[PDB]
Design a protein around this ligand. Structure first.
Ligand code: NA
Ligand code: RH
Ligand code: RH
Ligand code: RH
Ligand code: RH
Ligand code: RH
Ligand code: RH
Ligand code: RH
Length: 129
């Protein structure tokens, strides 16, 4: 599913992401925009052989099992396929573990490079929340 901006903001807010570990909703929407272009089905293979899955491009080396990432952990205890669903519940639950892990939203390279220190409120402007 390719989400609209406000449709995703709404779904993320419902699932507890607005100010989760102090990160405003706009941060989470900006990160999804630059990680996945709001496409739940996005996958991207990494040079290390790991793959990034779903709306927030969650990595198979640490977070999910895809059965082809040697020496990988599955810290969110889910198949990576679960992260591609039109239902974002699994991606959100795993994002909460990732953002709690010590580097906060710097875990998302597109967030650090394209959202961090920007007017992220602009990503939720004109949305009914
Ligand atoms: Na894994
Ligand atoms: Rh939902
Ligand atoms: Rh919950
Ligand atoms: Rh766009
Ligand atoms: Rh949750
Ligand atoms: Rh850790
Ligand atoms: Rh870690
Ligand atoms: Rh509200």
């Amino acid at each position: 599913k390719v989400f609209g901006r406000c449709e995703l903001a709404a779904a993320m807010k419902r699932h507890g992401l607005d100010n989760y570990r102090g990160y405003s909703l706009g941060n989470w929407v900006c990160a999804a925009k630059f990680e996945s272009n709001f496409n739940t089905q996005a996958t991207n293979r990494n040079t290390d052989g790991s793959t990034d899955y779903g709306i927030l491009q969650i990595n198979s080396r640490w977070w999910c099992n895809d059965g082809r990432t040697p020496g990988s952990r599955n810290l969110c205890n889910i198949p990576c396929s679960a992260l591609l669903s039109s239902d974002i519940t699994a991606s959100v639950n795993c994002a909460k573990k990732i953002v709690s892990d010590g580097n906060g939203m710097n875990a998302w390279v597109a967030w650090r490079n394209r959202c961090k220190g920007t007017d992220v409120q602009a990503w939720i402007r004109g949305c009914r929340l």
